[PDB]
Design a protein around this ligand. Structure first.
Ligand SMILES: NC(=[NH2+])c1ccc2[nH]c(-c3ccccc3[O-])nc2c1
Ligand SMILES: [Ca+2]
Ligand SMILES: [Cl-]
Length: 223
């Protein structure tokens, strides 16, 4: 997260870190056995880490559970990143409490202007790599479709939305991929891509979760 602030330990209880010997992506806990992340974060050997704050120190509240299966959306296109969503089923259920809690799926899409919270352990520099030890937060608004399409002409599908600041300085960045964009208490986006980090006129692009709610519910119901 570039231009963000320290969230405070366990203030984002649905945030998870996907770990394969190191933190590589974020994700959101939606029920005690399922996590939603981005299809581009897929790999085998994933250990999901819940109740984390400092990812390099065990401090208490952490739950490390291995993933039993990862379901990448069947129509995920790795070249356009359209349908960039993946569901991970955990080997055992997480113990939920106030430090580890699930986030609700939306019942409607959000409108531009809606203010949202984006969080993650990704890079905090737009030029160079500086990964933090603790979770960073950023409040960003959803942008109108014309500003998003004018920023990335021909690269935005109806399953994507832009959120951020055109003046630059604040944005999600690598290491944040797969993580949550929560607005009014609902999971509305997943950190997907952007051109560089915090560059002027290049806002972040997020998977529009309101378009996959029936798919998420049907897929969890059948697995
Ligand atoms: N500017 C942004 N809002 C942004 C967000 C997520 C990103 N993820 C990445 C990324 C870069 C290299 C490898 C994997 C990634 O997900 N770049 C990213 C840029
Ligand atoms: Ca820790
Ligand atoms: Cl266009």
């Amino acid at each position: 997260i570039v231009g963000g602030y320290t969230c405070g330990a366990n203030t984002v209880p649905y945030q998870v870190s996907l770990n394969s010997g190191y933190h590589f992506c974020g994700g959101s806990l939606i029920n005690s056995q399922w996590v939603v992340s981005a299809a581009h974060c897929y790999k085998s050997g994933i250990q999901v880490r819940l109740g984390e704050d400092n990812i390099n120190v065990v401090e208490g509240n952490e739950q490390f559970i291995s993933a039993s299966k990862s379901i990448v959306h069947p129509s995920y296109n790795s070249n356009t990143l359209n349908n960039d969503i993946m569901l991970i089923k955990l080997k055992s259920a997480a113990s939920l409490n106030s430090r580890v809690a699930s986030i609700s799926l939306p019942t409607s899409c959000a409108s531009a202007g809606t203010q949202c919270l984006i969080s993650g352990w990704g890079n905090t520099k737009s030029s160079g790599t500086s990964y933090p030890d603790v979770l960073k937060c950023l409040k960003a608004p959803i942008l109108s479709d014309s500003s998003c399409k004018s920023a990335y002409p021909g690269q935005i599908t109806s399953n994507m939305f832009c959120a951020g600041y055109l003046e630059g300085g604040k944005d999600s960045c690598q290491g944040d991929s797969g993580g949550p964009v929560v607005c009014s208490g609902k999971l509305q986006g997943i950190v997907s891509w952007g051109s560089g980090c915090a560059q002027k006129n290049k806002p972040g692009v997020y998977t529009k979760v309101c378009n996959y709610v029936s798919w998420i519910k049907q897929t969890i119901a059948s697995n």
